[PDB]
Symmetry: C3
Subunit: 437 residues, 3 copies
């Protein structure tokens, strides 16, 4: 869509809007299964027995791995979830008596089946590999007369089990993202199609398979009665196509000559924001979200739920309805923030700060303060010894002029070195130390 951006000279911040949400709100747990086989020398046979040893070792390795129950600025404000708690709950259910054999018979004549579990969970079940049938029908007649083509074919069919076992071996039975060995592209797509979700969610997931993989978990579960089972925990996107915007912030300092006499302020509420259920889902670690064109994929486990009035901080940081969060300091170091459609430059001290085009070099020299340049005609920005490439996605930027709010503060009573602060908190500290003077 149309991505747009606004820079607020008054608060050294920029908002990128036009994005659409895809928030993981829940989990769908499926049970993926591989059916196992209970079981002089020719050259072609010696390799078959070598591959068969790799197969038993993989089985006993996975059995040995399952002796234990499976487990695994404003970010510090986040709660603490247990991401695979739902999959582990389902996996705990697979250990009950004859619960495994319910699945075994469900998939006797199909590869995809839905099974109600004894506690009422309605899971999709998938037999992705019948090694039982291959080994019993093609390999067992030889062991109880070899060609080279079955050796090739066995290695191919056994390779998937060996790779699944490798992933679980270096990841303590819990992997993310979910590899194509756990679930092939076609398997996952068909799993998505049979999922109980909207046509909207099916289209979204099918068109973003790579993101679904990254937000999914594979939990090695049980080996019992010739059945290898691991739970695949898939994301549920209960919030879709709501407006999202990214808030970029950078430090705003006074620019006095006498070094150390300068005071700084930085909006700490940077990150992603998406409208969600009458509130705003705020993701302080914008690293958690994944952007595909204009679609933002986030996990609500790494969000706060804030009043929508938090959006007022962008137009009016002194608004009376929400207490905008800032941090203060006297550390006027130079840096840049690359935004969606431009660049914020916090230039202080003796630092060289410029913006350049690929064919003509420097086109703007910044002066001390916080400033901004859009990515039209600009390819790179330099702050000191650091070169930043700007994003070259298209979209209009708007420079909103306004006086830097740091000018409104008397440095002699300014409370520096406050991190978890806000506009009101800084006011009340000022008007206390003012009371003594």
């Amino acid at each position: 869509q149309n991505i747009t951006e606004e820079f607020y000279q008054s608060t050294c911040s920029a908002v990128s809007k036009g994005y659409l949400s895809a928030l993981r709100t829940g989990w769908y747990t499926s049970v993926i299964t591989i059916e196992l086989s209970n079981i002089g020398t020719d050259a072609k046979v010696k390799l078959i027995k070598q591959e068969l040893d790799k197969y038993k070792n993989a089985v006993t390795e996975l059995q040995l791995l399952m002796q234990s129950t499976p487990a695994t600025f404003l970010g510090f404000l986040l709660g603490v979830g247990s991401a695979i708690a739902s999959g582990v709950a389902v996996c705990k259910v697979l250990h009950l008596e004859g619960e495994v054999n319910k699945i075994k018979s469900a998939l006797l004549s199909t590869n995809k089946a839905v099974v109600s579990l004894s506690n009422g969970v309605s899971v999709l079940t998938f037999k992705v590999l019948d090694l039982k049938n291959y080994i019993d029908k093609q390999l067992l007649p030889i062991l109880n007369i070899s060609n080279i083509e079955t050796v090739i074919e066995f290695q191919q069919k056994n390779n998937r089990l060996l790779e699944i076992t490798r992933e679980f071996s270096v990841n303590a039975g819990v992997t993310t993202p979910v590899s194509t060995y756990m679930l092939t592209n076609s398997e996952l797509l068909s799993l998505i199609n049979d999922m109980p979700i909207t046509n909207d969610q099916k289209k979204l997931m099918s068109n973003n398979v790579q993101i679904v993989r990254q937000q999914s978990y594979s939990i090695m579960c049980i080996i019992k009665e010739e059945v290898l089972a691991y739970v695949v925990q898939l994301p549920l996107y209960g919030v879709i196509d709501t407006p999202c915007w990214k808030l970029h912030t950078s430090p705003l300092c006074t620019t006095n000559t006498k070094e150390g006499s300068n005071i700084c302020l930085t909006r700490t509420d940077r990150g992603w924001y998406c409208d969600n259920a009458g509130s705003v889902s705020f993701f302080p670690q914008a690293e958690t979200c994944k952007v595909q064109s204009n679609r933002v994929f986030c996990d609500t486990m790494n969000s706060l739920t804030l009043p929508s009035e938090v959006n007022l901080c962008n137009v009016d940081i002194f608004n009376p309805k929400y207490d905008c969060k800032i941090m203060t300091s006297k550390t006027d170091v130079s840096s840049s923030v690359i935004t969606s459609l431009g660049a914020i430059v916090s230039c202080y001290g003796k630092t060289k700060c410029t913006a350049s085009n690929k064919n003509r070099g420097i086109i703007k020299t910044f002066s001390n303060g916080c400033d901004y340049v859009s990515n039209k005609g600009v390819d790179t920005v330099s702050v000191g010894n650091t070169l930043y490439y700007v994003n070259k996605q298209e979209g209009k930027s708007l420079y909103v002029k306004g006086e830097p709010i740091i000018n409104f503060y008397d440095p002699l009573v300014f409370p520096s070195d406050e991190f978890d602060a806000s506009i009101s908190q800084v006011n009340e500290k000022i008007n206390q130390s003012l009371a003594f003077i």
Copy 2:
């Protein structure tokens, strides 16, 4: 074992106990080796020469990689170690004159051998792959008459070297966890059995191979005199089966109507705790520890060693023997902490906070404040737009009633925005600003 949990309404925190320790306290270094070979066209031979090129390229790649010496709330309180310093020391010893050939002759007639190094280190040595013998006896007669079965067999035997070389290529010669290509499951188990440790440590490591892999390092060391050698650094668990407990904390705020008039406090001493040598090993980043049933695997490199009196903060946060660490703020945002056996809910402002069961939906609505619900009969908790699944492991929870200690503070003199603080420090700041008023 029996995991139990206690929630302290007074301080918005919960302790999970019943766990048993397995703390990595040291390192065991082994030297793993692969013996190398110094060395019209038929179809079967062209593939043999293609595989042989892959083998030389892997050798020269590993030689090119070794031109350099190998290298690689309260977390900020931690020291700073050098994790592979012991392996690198051993690897430095392998570069001495004829030191490589000591190993070469030790493993002439065995694959597992113990070798005393020239500085006195007593290392286990392992020849996991004799490519020398394979190439010289099966491949060299052909090059200096091809069947397809050796082409298959050569690719299999060479694959391990190619995979080891890949891992070292994308990891600058130092890998963790240690893959099954570095050390197969059977190789590691037998390596563990020949280790100089207790039957307790051998059983523990053999039953938790996947955890040993994650706490181990593979350090590519030397290629010299037809010997490829890399050091595998294995964990030593010098602390085993001592009591451990997990401390979960969440913010505790007043719940006044007038927004911004509320003060908050959070216990910052959350993480894992294990009794250890008359003190308490405290792991502030509980992400560092790995839980297998009731066994907690931690690394003492990411611990502080604290007086055992730190445990008093759970029963009496005002105790006179240890100065319990808290942080203060006015940031009353809502969130939840999922514990071992329940959930802490810090619910403030206008946030919807509930606890639900899978079959009947909402069963508890939280009111403003810090509260808790056990995982019996509860499957999920919701705070705002965030759904948390609770862990469904069994164990008894105890709700310990008590007045939230935040009520004991006058907001007008409460020192907010203190992170590295404590009960005594907040008292002494209060009684200073009180002195002026």
Copy 3:
């Protein structure tokens, strides 16, 4: 070279010097290409058709993956770049009309070619795999008469495409480090040789291929007109062979008997420092830099550019030219920092702190305070329940005696719990609270 180290008893810090810089300052973007093929049963043929299905699935998988534009103490002071912004810009250029076919014809008769793009970018282009030619000439005659040797050969040639597709599938089309499947060791070396850089940079990159891989990105770009193209973003080292030094800091506390009466101070400016263009590039997260012998590889994106006067803080922390950054607290916990050539020990309270040799055990017991021991004759240091191995690289340490500056502060007016502070800031807070007393 000669690594040396100095410990400053007065400020509980140590500097390691003698290192040489290799700073990534820029990016070189190359376009790697793979030429694709538009396309009863014998046993040997059934496997060929199985491998051919793996090939189509890989193609449609990569097409499905590209529906979206590709994307991906003092660290908080850093700016925020967009690391693959330059590669994505080039990739955006490959989507223009007939721009793909410019590359297609450039590499018609060569595998390495330089192509000027329509916006003026001069990129190197590389055809690493002609699957088009293999499938059309060897496989198509069979499908439109099988031996086992082509089945083997096809699987080998198709394996690279399958592995590239796997990496892009679990990494949303953007990978780092760049694997040997993206770019083999010989391909990368030859790519480096044809790069437009100095003989100095070519030697440096060729001798540190593993570091180049870790600082590189592979960006899946386009599949169009039988051409698979992904951009490889290689580092440009515009700063080479300038002096670097590592600053290690640890907490400095008073050591009074009465617990809680102690005040602490820690230099927060720890990390790597390299001379760069008349300033100093400061890398606060020393984890970002990679050390190969005496060569330090860093990324200027994770640096601040500071006045070179920052170096004065090591000899004179009260110097009048630069305001040295410290943090304050009353949290006198014990810990150690392992340096390049020794160990800093911050020992407080009741903690056992010692230094040991492998053959003789304890050789030094530290007393309360901040102290240091060089790695000559010392193999391990113990602080509480934590054993640290010291680095055993050779080089001389110098112990610079001086009174711990924490003694210069009256605890009754000492401002504790200041994180983003400095020497001057602590002075001005003291002389304010002093004014009231």
